[PDB]
Design a protein around this ligand. Sequence first.
Ligand SMILES: *SCc1c(C)c(OC)c(C)c[n+]1-c1nc2ccc(OC)nc2[nH]1
Length: 144
Amino acid sequence: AVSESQLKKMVSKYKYRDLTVRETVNVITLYKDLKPVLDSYVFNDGSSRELMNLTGTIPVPYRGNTYNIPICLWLLDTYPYNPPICFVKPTSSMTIKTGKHVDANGKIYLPYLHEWKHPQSDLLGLIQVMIVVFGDEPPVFSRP
Ligand SMILES: *SCc1c(C)c(OC)c(C)c[n+]1-c1nc2ccc(OC)nc2[nH]1
């Protein structure tokens, strides 16, 4: 379990630890389905830095059918002035259908993000928007 005090230690490496910590509270307090976890990251330079990431699932209604989408959010050490890179966990029956916002590596582009004024949409906005911008056309789906 991650405590808020500990949360500071976890994102102490970032330059905006206050807004991020405060903002995460909003995300895990309202979206408890998103849990923060500490992870080790290795850069090409060989230098290592401990970064915290949000990992879990988001229930999404679709065609009367609902799927449990597993997603991992990695924050850049310069977050939130830097956009967050997202990765969608694929499976044998779930594939990535490239389209208007999904590439082949699982990158997610969202118009609200390009017009997101800091701090208005906030991370919490990204998740409900994720629930909406993916409901319009699930970039991923289960194929028998
Ligand atoms: S958020 C990715 C993830 C998940 C979902 C998970 O839960 C089933 C476990 C056990 C591990 N990871 C994950 N993927 C990683 C890539 C690199 C890294 O740094 C060493 N840590 C990762 N943890």
